[PDB]
Amino acid sequence: NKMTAYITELSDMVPTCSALARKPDKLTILRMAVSHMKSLELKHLILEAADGFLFIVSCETGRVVYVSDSVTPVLNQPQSEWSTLYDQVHPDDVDKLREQLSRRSFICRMRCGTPHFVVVHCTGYIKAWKFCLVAIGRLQVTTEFISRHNIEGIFTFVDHRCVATVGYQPQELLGKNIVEFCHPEDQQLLRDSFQQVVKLKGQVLSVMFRFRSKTREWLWMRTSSFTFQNPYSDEIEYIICTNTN
Amino acid sequence: ETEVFYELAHELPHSVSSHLDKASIMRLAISFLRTHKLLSSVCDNLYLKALEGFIAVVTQDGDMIFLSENISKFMGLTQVELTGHSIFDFTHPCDHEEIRENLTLSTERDFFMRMKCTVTNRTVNLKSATWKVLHCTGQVRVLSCLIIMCEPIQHPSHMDIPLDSKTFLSRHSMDMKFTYCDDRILELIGYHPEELLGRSAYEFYHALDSENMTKSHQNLCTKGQVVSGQYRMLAKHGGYVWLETQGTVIYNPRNLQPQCIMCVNYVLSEIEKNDVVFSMD
Ligand SMILES: Brc1ccc([C@H]2CN3CCSC3=N2)cc1
């Protein structure tokens, strides 16, 4: 039944066979497959799968001896423009590059033009031609300030936006507890949510309190807090907070 | 019927085509022109060799209508044994449903699936295959279709490719506490192993990244192999650096137990936001 379904499928796939008034036989069906491919890309599969392109450089000096045209779709450059890989790569990657010049494999962020860099996973090998690298570079898939706390409320992490949001340089904020900056009247409430976000392990509460500015102005703020747990231990390593003016 | 078949076979190497059966020259013929149907809609020894992986096209209902020729170099099973048979017949059932919904229906896909391996780190055969995690990135495209390249993650106890300056090894407990680090990282990121030892890896990632690590970590555990995205570990005296790490779970070969996680960590950037300070350390 499956040989026949291959017989039938094959013929459906041979336009020369399936453009016919009837269904012929296997000797014939086998025969017209044979001629239909006796009649009659990988880089498209590559660029269609990973947004990769091929390129060939000299190992001795790092200058290009071949570039696939996929460079234009992949990273917007003209094949005519793609020279020396060192000119194409981010300056902070020259070093890395030079020791990759057995097979080879690495990563580096190369420019795009119309200064923007795109990180590209590179794969290939060295062949003799005083030698050459044969590689494929592929592309990858992808007001408020955020802080983070140990269970007790001590600032373990803050991003620079704290100075824009509360006026304190990170360092002043870090190490201290938040309730040190809360307004007295609101402090249990802050602690409450801290007593709560843990009790409600996993997901968020939000709490609002007057936070101390550096110029000492009490500021209304809303904080969205959730505990973050180890994916292995389920240990509550920290609770993450985004504190929002 | 043998004469017609063996020049069908030998206009599909005449070496490998000399040995094909009925059902398989059927499958290879059928899938060759089926593939050609998709390529018309998309639009070598070095292309093929220069891949740390093979390319596969897989239908929304699961058939493998084409696999990379170099497939056998990574997974042992050659191009001709598995073409046209189901992907579901060669990958982990616990991964299957996730594979199913990657075949289904934003175009870009990126994930990890365990297949079957029958090439030793020479060759053994199906009853003694081992499951091999594959990192797969591609497009799903219109009958639907999946076009992924599949890269195996090099195992860090047995590596073939050199490693440059900007990479540093690392060992962790299964919950990812640093339980050993490379000495250079100091010159790289600026920490001696001493401080890192006994420390959760998670108090060194920048906060916006922690959620994306969890997935990498659970992939690592459930499958035992993984590549992270880009992320930034916080650095010595302020700023961070960008890393990509291959993380594999290594076992004691004596008691069949998970022992630790070893990670190769490619540094991709020098310190950035050096002025700013993020964490207590
Ligand atoms: Br996947 C994955 C996620 C994290 C890690 C470890 C290794 N390493 C290098 C500096 S920060 C850090 N955490 C390994 C694999």
Side-chain angles (χ1 to χ4, degrees), chain A residues 43-55 67-79 82 108 110-113 116-122 135-140, chain B residues 47 139 149:
Chain A
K43 58 145 293 188
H44 307 120
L45 270 184
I46 297 325
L47 160 64
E48 148 78 11
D51 290 30
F53 72 95
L54 185 125
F55 57 91
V67 74
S68 148
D69 56 353
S70 322
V71 167
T72 309
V74 166
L75 48 80
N76 177 276
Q77 292 294 97
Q79 164 138 311
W82 259 63
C108 60
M110 325 167 168
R111 45 182 31 160
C112 295
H116 184 314
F117 292 98
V118 75
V119 316
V120 54
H121 295 194
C122 297
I136 293 206
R138 80 151 166 94
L139 204 35
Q140 322 68 46
Chain B
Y47 270 103
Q139 302 284 23
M149 163 168 20

mmCIF file of all heavy atoms in Angstrom, chain A residues 43-55 67-79 82 108 110-113 116-122 135-140, chain B residues 47 139 149:
data_model
loop_
_atom_site.group_PDB
_atom_site.id
_atom_site.type_symbol
_atom_site.label_atom_id
_atom_site.label_comp_id
_atom_site.label_asym_id
_atom_site.label_seq_id
_atom_site.Cartn_x
_atom_site.Cartn_y
_atom_site.Cartn_z
ATOM 1 N N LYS A 43 22.919 27.551 -0.486
ATOM 2 C CA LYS A 43 23.035 28.869 0.123
ATOM 3 C C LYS A 43 21.669 29.510 0.396
ATOM 4 O O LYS A 43 21.531 30.269 1.361
ATOM 5 C CB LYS A 43 23.936 29.762 -0.735
ATOM 6 C CG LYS A 43 23.538 29.966 -2.136
ATOM 7 C CD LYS A 43 23.891 31.396 -2.564
ATOM 8 C CE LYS A 43 23.039 32.417 -1.809
ATOM 9 N NZ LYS A 43 23.193 33.826 -2.326
ATOM 10 N N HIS A 44 20.647 29.204 -0.403
ATOM 11 C CA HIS A 44 19.293 29.686 -0.097
ATOM 12 C C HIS A 44 18.713 29.026 1.139
ATOM 13 O O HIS A 44 18.197 29.717 2.026
ATOM 14 C CB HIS A 44 18.445 29.472 -1.331
ATOM 15 C CG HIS A 44 19.091 30.086 -2.523
ATOM 16 N ND1 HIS A 44 19.468 29.369 -3.638
ATOM 17 C CD2 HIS A 44 19.424 31.377 -2.770
ATOM 18 C CE1 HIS A 44 20.049 30.187 -4.498
ATOM 19 N NE2 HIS A 44 20.019 31.413 -4.005
ATOM 20 N N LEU A 45 18.839 27.705 1.236
ATOM 21 C CA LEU A 45 18.539 27.017 2.484
ATOM 22 C C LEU A 45 19.288 27.630 3.658
ATOM 23 O O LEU A 45 18.699 27.828 4.732
ATOM 24 C CB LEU A 45 18.895 25.547 2.334
ATOM 25 C CG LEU A 45 17.716 24.758 1.819
ATOM 26 C CD1 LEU A 45 18.141 23.345 1.795
ATOM 27 C CD2 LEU A 45 16.501 24.965 2.733
ATOM 28 N N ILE A 46 20.575 27.957 3.480
ATOM 29 C CA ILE A 46 21.308 28.556 4.594
ATOM 30 C C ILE A 46 20.702 29.907 4.952
ATOM 31 O O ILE A 46 20.289 30.144 6.098
ATOM 32 C CB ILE A 46 22.799 28.727 4.259
ATOM 33 C CG1 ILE A 46 23.522 27.368 4.003
ATOM 34 C CG2 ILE A 46 23.466 29.599 5.352
ATOM 35 C CD1 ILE A 46 23.016 26.221 4.864
ATOM 36 N N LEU A 47 20.647 30.816 3.964
ATOM 37 C CA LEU A 47 20.184 32.172 4.229
ATOM 38 C C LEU A 47 18.713 32.186 4.602
ATOM 39 O O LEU A 47 18.260 33.064 5.355
ATOM 40 C CB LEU A 47 20.408 33.033 3.007
ATOM 41 C CG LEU A 47 19.557 34.295 2.977
ATOM 42 C CD1 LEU A 47 19.947 35.203 4.137
ATOM 43 C CD2 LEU A 47 19.698 34.967 1.637
ATOM 44 N N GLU A 48 17.954 31.202 4.120
ATOM 45 C CA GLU A 48 16.555 31.153 4.515
ATOM 46 C C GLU A 48 16.417 30.638 5.942
ATOM 47 O O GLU A 48 15.522 31.071 6.668
ATOM 48 C CB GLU A 48 15.764 30.321 3.497
ATOM 49 C CG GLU A 48 14.584 29.531 3.993
ATOM 50 C CD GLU A 48 13.355 30.412 4.201
ATOM 51 O OE1 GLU A 48 13.382 31.602 3.740
ATOM 52 O OE2 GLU A 48 12.355 29.909 4.801
ATOM 53 N N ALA A 49 17.340 29.791 6.402
ATOM 54 C CA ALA A 49 17.197 29.243 7.749
ATOM 55 C C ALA A 49 17.735 30.183 8.817
ATOM 56 O O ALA A 49 17.049 30.477 9.802
ATOM 57 C CB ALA A 49 17.905 27.895 7.862
ATOM 58 N N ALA A 50 18.975 30.631 8.663
ATOM 59 C CA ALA A 50 19.663 31.316 9.740
ATOM 60 C C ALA A 50 20.037 32.750 9.418
ATOM 61 O O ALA A 50 20.565 33.442 10.295
ATOM 62 C CB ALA A 50 20.933 30.556 10.124
ATOM 63 N N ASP A 51 19.741 33.221 8.216
ATOM 64 C CA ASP A 51 20.221 34.514 7.759
ATOM 65 C C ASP A 51 21.735 34.523 7.725
ATOM 66 O O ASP A 51 22.376 35.533 8.005
ATOM 67 C CB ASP A 51 19.671 35.660 8.599
ATOM 68 C CG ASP A 51 18.187 35.872 8.361
ATOM 69 O OD1 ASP A 51 17.467 34.879 8.051
ATOM 70 O OD2 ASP A 51 17.763 37.050 8.406
ATOM 71 N N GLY A 52 22.295 33.382 7.350
ATOM 72 C CA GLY A 52 23.715 33.244 7.146
ATOM 73 C C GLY A 52 24.163 33.510 5.717
ATOM 74 O O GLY A 52 23.386 33.426 4.771
ATOM 75 N N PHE A 53 25.454 33.816 5.587
ATOM 76 C CA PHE A 53 26.145 34.038 4.324
ATOM 77 C C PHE A 53 27.535 33.425 4.422
ATOM 78 O O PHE A 53 28.072 33.267 5.519
ATOM 79 C CB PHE A 53 26.250 35.536 3.992
ATOM 80 C CG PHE A 53 27.215 36.290 4.852
ATOM 81 C CD1 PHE A 53 28.504 36.503 4.434
ATOM 82 C CD2 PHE A 53 26.830 36.787 6.083
ATOM 83 C CE1 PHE A 53 29.393 37.224 5.213
ATOM 84 C CE2 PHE A 53 27.728 37.486 6.877
ATOM 85 C CZ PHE A 53 29.009 37.704 6.427
ATOM 86 N N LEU A 54 28.128 33.104 3.274
ATOM 87 C CA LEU A 54 29.464 32.522 3.217
ATOM 88 C C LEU A 54 30.488 33.586 2.826
ATOM 89 O O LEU A 54 30.156 34.575 2.166
ATOM 90 C CB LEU A 54 29.501 31.351 2.226
ATOM 91 C CG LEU A 54 30.776 30.506 2.087
ATOM 92 C CD1 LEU A 54 30.558 28.993 2.287
ATOM 93 C CD2 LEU A 54 31.404 30.770 0.726
ATOM 94 N N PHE A 55 31.730 33.390 3.278
ATOM 95 C CA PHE A 55 32.854 34.260 2.938
ATOM 96 C C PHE A 55 34.153 33.495 3.136
ATOM 97 O O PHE A 55 34.207 32.524 3.903
ATOM 98 C CB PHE A 55 32.874 35.560 3.747
ATOM 99 C CG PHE A 55 32.892 35.358 5.239
ATOM 100 C CD1 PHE A 55 34.087 35.275 5.930
ATOM 101 C CD2 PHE A 55 31.707 35.224 5.948
ATOM 102 C CE1 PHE A 55 34.108 35.096 7.309
ATOM 103 C CE2 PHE A 55 31.706 35.047 7.325
ATOM 104 C CZ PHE A 55 32.912 34.983 8.012
ATOM 105 N N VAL A 67 33.362 36.410 -1.274
ATOM 106 C CA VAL A 67 32.171 36.665 -0.465
ATOM 107 C C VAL A 67 30.941 36.200 -1.237
ATOM 108 O O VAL A 67 30.784 36.512 -2.420
ATOM 109 C CB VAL A 67 32.022 38.139 -0.017
ATOM 110 C CG1 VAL A 67 31.583 39.052 -1.147
ATOM 111 C CG2 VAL A 67 31.010 38.204 1.082
ATOM 112 N N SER A 68 30.112 35.387 -0.587
ATOM 113 C CA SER A 68 28.777 35.103 -1.087
ATOM 114 C C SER A 68 28.003 36.402 -1.214
ATOM 115 O O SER A 68 28.239 37.365 -0.479
ATOM 116 C CB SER A 68 28.052 34.141 -0.141
ATOM 117 O OG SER A 68 26.657 34.369 -0.101
ATOM 118 N N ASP A 69 27.095 36.443 -2.182
ATOM 119 C CA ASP A 69 26.255 37.622 -2.266
ATOM 120 C C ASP A 69 25.279 37.719 -1.114
ATOM 121 O O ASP A 69 24.692 38.788 -0.931
ATOM 122 C CB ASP A 69 25.513 37.663 -3.604
ATOM 123 C CG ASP A 69 24.684 36.413 -3.858
ATOM 124 O OD1 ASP A 69 24.774 35.445 -3.061
ATOM 125 O OD2 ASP A 69 23.955 36.402 -4.874
ATOM 126 N N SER A 70 25.112 36.665 -0.308
ATOM 127 C CA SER A 70 24.103 36.786 0.740
ATOM 128 C C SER A 70 24.438 37.897 1.724
ATOM 129 O O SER A 70 23.622 38.217 2.598
ATOM 130 C CB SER A 70 23.922 35.467 1.490
ATOM 131 O OG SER A 70 24.002 34.359 0.615
ATOM 132 N N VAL A 71 25.607 38.507 1.580
ATOM 133 C CA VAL A 71 25.981 39.601 2.459
ATOM 134 C C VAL A 71 24.960 40.721 2.395
ATOM 135 O O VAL A 71 24.577 41.297 3.422
ATOM 136 C CB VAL A 71 27.388 40.075 2.091
ATOM 137 C CG1 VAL A 71 27.707 41.392 2.742
ATOM 138 C CG2 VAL A 71 28.327 39.098 2.616
ATOM 139 N N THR A 72 24.461 41.014 1.204
ATOM 140 C CA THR A 72 23.506 42.112 1.094
ATOM 141 C C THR A 72 22.215 41.797 1.841
ATOM 142 O O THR A 72 21.788 42.621 2.669
ATOM 143 C CB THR A 72 23.225 42.427 -0.374
ATOM 144 O OG1 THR A 72 24.463 42.603 -1.075
ATOM 145 C CG2 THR A 72 22.459 43.715 -0.433
ATOM 146 N N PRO A 73 21.547 40.654 1.619
ATOM 147 C CA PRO A 73 20.371 40.384 2.456
ATOM 148 C C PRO A 73 20.732 40.285 3.913
ATOM 149 O O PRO A 73 20.008 40.822 4.759
ATOM 150 C CB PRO A 73 19.844 39.052 1.916
ATOM 151 C CG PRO A 73 20.985 38.436 1.219
ATOM 152 C CD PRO A 73 21.761 39.567 0.637
ATOM 153 N N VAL A 74 21.842 39.622 4.237
ATOM 154 C CA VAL A 74 22.089 39.306 5.630
ATOM 155 C C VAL A 74 22.402 40.579 6.409
ATOM 156 O O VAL A 74 21.744 40.897 7.408
ATOM 157 C CB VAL A 74 23.212 38.273 5.769
ATOM 158 C CG1 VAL A 74 23.664 38.241 7.211
ATOM 159 C CG2 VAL A 74 22.744 36.912 5.306
ATOM 160 N N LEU A 75 23.383 41.349 5.951
ATOM 161 C CA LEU A 75 23.806 42.474 6.765
ATOM 162 C C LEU A 75 23.851 43.769 5.982
ATOM 163 O O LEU A 75 24.536 44.710 6.409
ATOM 164 C CB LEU A 75 25.157 42.177 7.439
ATOM 165 C CG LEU A 75 26.272 41.610 6.572
ATOM 166 C CD1 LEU A 75 26.907 42.691 5.807
ATOM 167 C CD2 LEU A 75 27.284 40.945 7.465
ATOM 168 N N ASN A 76 23.158 43.833 4.843
ATOM 169 C CA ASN A 76 22.899 45.075 4.128
ATOM 170 C C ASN A 76 24.157 45.596 3.449
ATOM 171 O O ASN A 76 24.165 46.687 2.925
ATOM 172 C CB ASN A 76 22.267 46.085 5.102
ATOM 173 C CG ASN A 76 22.021 47.435 4.502
ATOM 174 O OD1 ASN A 76 22.908 48.289 4.452
ATOM 175 N ND2 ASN A 76 20.785 47.659 4.074
ATOM 176 N N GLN A 77 25.208 44.813 3.400
ATOM 177 C CA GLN A 77 26.325 45.415 2.681
ATOM 178 C C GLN A 77 26.361 44.958 1.222
ATOM 179 O O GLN A 77 25.920 43.851 0.902
ATOM 180 C CB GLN A 77 27.662 45.050 3.332
ATOM 181 C CG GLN A 77 28.013 45.613 4.734
ATOM 182 C CD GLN A 77 28.206 47.109 4.770
ATOM 183 O OE1 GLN A 77 27.298 47.850 5.117
ATOM 184 N NE2 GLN A 77 29.383 47.567 4.345
ATOM 185 N N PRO A 78 26.901 45.779 0.314
ATOM 186 C CA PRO A 78 27.195 45.302 -1.056
ATOM 187 C C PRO A 78 28.343 44.299 -1.136
ATOM 188 O O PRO A 78 29.399 44.474 -0.524
ATOM 189 C CB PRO A 78 27.544 46.587 -1.823
ATOM 190 C CG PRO A 78 26.943 47.685 -1.001
ATOM 191 C CD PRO A 78 27.017 47.238 0.431
ATOM 192 N N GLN A 79 28.125 43.241 -1.930
ATOM 193 C CA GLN A 79 29.190 42.291 -2.231
ATOM 194 C C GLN A 79 30.403 43.025 -2.774
ATOM 195 O O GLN A 79 31.546 42.638 -2.497
ATOM 196 C CB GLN A 79 28.681 41.248 -3.239
ATOM 197 C CG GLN A 79 29.760 40.421 -3.939
ATOM 198 C CD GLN A 79 29.368 38.955 -4.044
ATOM 199 O OE1 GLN A 79 28.968 38.359 -3.063
ATOM 200 N NE2 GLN A 79 29.506 38.372 -5.219
ATOM 201 N N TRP A 82 32.410 44.265 0.210
ATOM 202 C CA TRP A 82 33.135 43.267 1.001
ATOM 203 C C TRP A 82 34.274 42.667 0.193
ATOM 204 O O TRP A 82 35.411 42.668 0.659
ATOM 205 C CB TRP A 82 32.200 42.175 1.504
ATOM 206 C CG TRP A 82 31.805 42.341 2.941
ATOM 207 C CD1 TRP A 82 31.102 43.386 3.477
ATOM 208 C CD2 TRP A 82 31.939 41.376 3.988
ATOM 209 N NE1 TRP A 82 30.857 43.158 4.807
ATOM 210 C CE2 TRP A 82 31.354 41.925 5.142
ATOM 211 C CE3 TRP A 82 32.524 40.109 4.070
ATOM 212 C CZ2 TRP A 82 31.353 41.256 6.369
ATOM 213 C CZ3 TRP A 82 32.522 39.441 5.296
ATOM 214 C CH2 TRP A 82 31.939 40.019 6.425
ATOM 215 N N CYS A 108 31.410 37.512 16.623
ATOM 216 C CA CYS A 108 31.938 38.867 16.501
ATOM 217 C C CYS A 108 30.829 39.749 15.969
ATOM 218 O O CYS A 108 29.935 39.273 15.266
ATOM 219 C CB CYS A 108 33.129 38.958 15.555
ATOM 220 S SG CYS A 108 32.775 38.450 13.884
ATOM 221 N N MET A 110 29.844 42.641 13.518
ATOM 222 C CA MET A 110 30.242 43.301 12.279
ATOM 223 C C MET A 110 29.271 44.433 11.920
ATOM 224 O O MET A 110 28.103 44.435 12.331
ATOM 225 C CB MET A 110 30.283 42.308 11.111
ATOM 226 C CG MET A 110 30.740 40.866 11.392
ATOM 227 S SD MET A 110 30.332 39.791 9.964
ATOM 228 C CE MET A 110 31.241 38.273 10.288
ATOM 229 N N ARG A 111 29.753 45.394 11.122
ATOM 230 C CA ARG A 111 28.954 46.586 10.811
ATOM 231 C C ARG A 111 27.978 46.297 9.684
ATOM 232 O O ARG A 111 28.211 45.428 8.848
ATOM 233 C CB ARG A 111 29.838 47.732 10.353
ATOM 234 C CG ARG A 111 30.851 47.233 9.359
ATOM 235 C CD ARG A 111 31.780 48.315 8.907
ATOM 236 N NE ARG A 111 31.944 49.252 10.008
ATOM 237 C CZ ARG A 111 32.957 50.095 10.114
ATOM 238 N NH1 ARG A 111 33.923 50.074 9.203
ATOM 239 N NH2 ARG A 111 33.023 50.894 11.166
ATOM 240 N N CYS A 112 26.938 47.139 9.606
ATOM 241 C CA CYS A 112 25.878 47.053 8.613
ATOM 242 C C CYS A 112 25.802 48.188 7.600
ATOM 243 O O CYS A 112 25.316 47.957 6.492
ATOM 244 C CB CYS A 112 24.520 47.025 9.306
ATOM 245 S SG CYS A 112 24.285 45.599 10.269
ATOM 246 N N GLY A 113 26.166 49.420 7.970
ATOM 247 C CA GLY A 113 25.987 50.534 7.044
ATOM 248 C C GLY A 113 24.534 50.838 6.657
ATOM 249 O O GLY A 113 23.570 50.301 7.201
ATOM 250 N N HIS A 116 26.395 50.868 13.067
ATOM 251 C CA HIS A 116 25.575 49.882 13.772
ATOM 252 C C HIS A 116 26.194 48.503 13.585
ATOM 253 O O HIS A 116 26.574 48.133 12.468
ATOM 254 C CB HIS A 116 24.123 49.924 13.242
ATOM 255 C CG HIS A 116 23.162 49.009 13.949
ATOM 256 N ND1 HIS A 116 23.443 47.690 14.238
ATOM 257 C CD2 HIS A 116 21.929 49.246 14.459
ATOM 258 C CE1 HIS A 116 22.421 47.149 14.880
ATOM 259 N NE2 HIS A 116 21.491 48.074 15.032
ATOM 260 N N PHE A 117 26.326 47.759 14.676
ATOM 261 C CA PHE A 117 26.926 46.437 14.624
ATOM 262 C C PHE A 117 25.906 45.353 14.927
ATOM 263 O O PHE A 117 24.967 45.555 15.690
ATOM 264 C CB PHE A 117 28.115 46.346 15.583
ATOM 265 C CG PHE A 117 29.270 47.191 15.163
ATOM 266 C CD1 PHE A 117 29.489 48.444 15.715
ATOM 267 C CD2 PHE A 117 30.131 46.720 14.183
ATOM 268 C CE1 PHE A 117 30.564 49.212 15.304
ATOM 269 C CE2 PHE A 117 31.196 47.484 13.763
ATOM 270 C CZ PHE A 117 31.419 48.736 14.339
ATOM 271 N N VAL A 118 26.094 44.201 14.311
ATOM 272 C CA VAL A 118 25.179 43.079 14.467
ATOM 273 C C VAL A 118 26.029 41.865 14.849
ATOM 274 O O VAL A 118 27.089 41.643 14.256
ATOM 275 C CB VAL A 118 24.345 42.903 13.167
ATOM 276 C CG1 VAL A 118 25.142 42.272 11.989
ATOM 277 C CG2 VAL A 118 23.065 42.161 13.411
ATOM 278 N N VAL A 119 25.655 41.141 15.912
ATOM 279 C CA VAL A 119 26.547 40.052 16.312
ATOM 280 C C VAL A 119 26.237 38.869 15.406
ATOM 281 O O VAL A 119 25.077 38.599 15.091
ATOM 282 C CB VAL A 119 26.411 39.656 17.802
ATOM 283 C CG1 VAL A 119 26.336 40.846 18.749
ATOM 284 C CG2 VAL A 119 25.369 38.623 18.052
ATOM 285 N N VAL A 120 27.272 38.163 14.971
ATOM 286 C CA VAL A 120 27.142 37.085 13.993
ATOM 287 C C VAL A 120 27.983 35.871 14.392
ATOM 288 O O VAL A 120 29.217 35.968 14.524
ATOM 289 C CB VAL A 120 27.510 37.551 12.571
ATOM 290 C CG1 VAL A 120 28.837 38.145 12.566
ATOM 291 C CG2 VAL A 120 27.640 36.316 11.721
ATOM 292 N N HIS A 121 27.316 34.709 14.529
ATOM 293 C CA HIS A 121 28.021 33.465 14.830
ATOM 294 C C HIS A 121 28.725 32.938 13.580
ATOM 295 O O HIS A 121 28.077 32.686 12.554
ATOM 296 C CB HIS A 121 27.059 32.419 15.360
ATOM 297 C CG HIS A 121 26.447 32.785 16.667
ATOM 298 N ND1 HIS A 121 25.779 31.876 17.460
ATOM 299 C CD2 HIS A 121 26.357 33.974 17.299
ATOM 300 C CE1 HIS A 121 25.321 32.487 18.536
ATOM 301 N NE2 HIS A 121 25.663 33.760 18.464
ATOM 302 N N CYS A 122 30.036 32.762 13.666
ATOM 303 C CA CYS A 122 30.845 32.392 12.514
ATOM 304 C C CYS A 122 31.359 30.964 12.645
ATOM 305 O O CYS A 122 31.817 30.545 13.707
ATOM 306 C CB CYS A 122 32.022 33.347 12.326
ATOM 307 S SG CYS A 122 31.566 35.044 11.966
ATOM 308 N N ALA A 135 34.239 30.475 5.818
ATOM 309 C CA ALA A 135 33.303 30.560 6.920
ATOM 310 C C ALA A 135 31.913 30.958 6.465
ATOM 311 O O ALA A 135 31.709 31.537 5.383
ATOM 312 C CB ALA A 135 33.797 31.526 7.992
ATOM 313 N N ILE A 136 30.989 30.673 7.379
ATOM 314 C CA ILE A 136 29.604 31.059 7.302
ATOM 315 C C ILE A 136 29.280 31.829 8.559
ATOM 316 O O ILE A 136 29.386 31.342 9.678
ATOM 317 C CB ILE A 136 28.701 29.831 7.162
ATOM 318 C CG1 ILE A 136 28.972 29.210 5.806
ATOM 319 C CG2 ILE A 136 27.223 30.248 7.333
ATOM 320 C CD1 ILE A 136 27.867 28.450 5.245
ATOM 321 N N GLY A 137 28.849 33.114 8.359
ATOM 322 C CA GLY A 137 28.372 33.913 9.443
ATOM 323 C C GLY A 137 26.883 33.994 9.414
ATOM 324 O O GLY A 137 26.273 34.391 8.418
ATOM 325 N N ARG A 138 26.242 33.637 10.525
ATOM 326 C CA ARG A 138 24.801 33.622 10.660
ATOM 327 C C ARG A 138 24.366 34.574 11.753
ATOM 328 O O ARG A 138 25.083 34.795 12.736
ATOM 329 C CB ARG A 138 24.302 32.208 10.973
ATOM 330 C CG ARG A 138 24.476 31.847 12.438
ATOM 331 C CD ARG A 138 23.432 30.876 12.862
ATOM 332 N NE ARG A 138 23.739 30.244 14.147
ATOM 333 C CZ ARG A 138 23.295 30.674 15.330
ATOM 334 N NH1 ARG A 138 22.521 31.740 15.434
ATOM 335 N NH2 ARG A 138 23.615 30.019 16.425
ATOM 336 N N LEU A 139 23.176 35.113 11.566
ATOM 337 C CA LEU A 139 22.530 36.044 12.474
ATOM 338 C C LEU A 139 21.607 35.287 13.427
ATOM 339 O O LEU A 139 21.316 34.103 13.232
ATOM 340 C CB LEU A 139 21.784 37.088 11.650
ATOM 341 C CG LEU A 139 21.557 38.403 12.359
ATOM 342 C CD1 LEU A 139 22.756 38.663 13.219
ATOM 343 C CD2 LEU A 139 21.434 39.515 11.331
ATOM 344 N N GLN A 140 21.185 35.971 14.494
ATOM 345 C CA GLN A 140 20.504 35.321 15.612
ATOM 346 C C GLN A 140 19.053 35.782 15.714
ATOM 347 O O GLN A 140 18.608 36.698 15.014
ATOM 348 C CB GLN A 140 21.209 35.577 16.950
ATOM 349 C CG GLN A 140 22.723 35.607 16.957
ATOM 350 C CD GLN A 140 23.285 36.794 16.213
ATOM 351 O OE1 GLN A 140 22.819 37.933 16.385
ATOM 352 N NE2 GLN A 140 24.310 36.549 15.401
ATOM 353 N N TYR B 47 30.310 25.138 1.564
ATOM 354 C CA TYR B 47 29.081 25.452 2.296
ATOM 355 C C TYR B 47 28.782 24.362 3.310
ATOM 356 O O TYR B 47 28.496 24.627 4.484
ATOM 357 C CB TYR B 47 27.899 25.584 1.333
ATOM 358 C CG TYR B 47 27.678 26.980 0.799
ATOM 359 C CD1 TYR B 47 28.061 27.316 -0.494
ATOM 360 C CD2 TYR B 47 27.085 27.962 1.578
ATOM 361 C CE1 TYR B 47 27.860 28.595 -0.996
ATOM 362 C CE2 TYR B 47 26.882 29.253 1.081
ATOM 363 C CZ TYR B 47 27.269 29.551 -0.200
ATOM 364 O OH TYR B 47 27.060 30.820 -0.680
ATOM 365 N N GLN B 139 13.087 29.359 9.921
ATOM 366 C CA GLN B 139 11.810 29.969 9.560
ATOM 367 C C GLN B 139 10.761 28.887 9.403
ATOM 368 O O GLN B 139 11.087 27.754 9.038
ATOM 369 C CB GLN B 139 11.970 30.749 8.260
ATOM 370 C CG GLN B 139 13.040 31.800 8.451
ATOM 371 C CD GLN B 139 12.579 32.997 9.241
ATOM 372 O OE1 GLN B 139 11.623 32.945 10.013
ATOM 373 N NE2 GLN B 139 13.407 34.016 9.220
ATOM 374 N N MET B 149 18.258 25.174 10.572
ATOM 375 C CA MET B 149 19.602 24.661 10.768
ATOM 376 C C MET B 149 19.722 24.176 12.191
ATOM 377 O O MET B 149 19.189 24.801 13.118
ATOM 378 C CB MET B 149 20.673 25.725 10.540
ATOM 379 C CG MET B 149 21.980 25.300 11.121
ATOM 380 S SD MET B 149 23.389 26.279 10.635
ATOM 381 C CE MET B 149 22.594 27.746 10.103
#
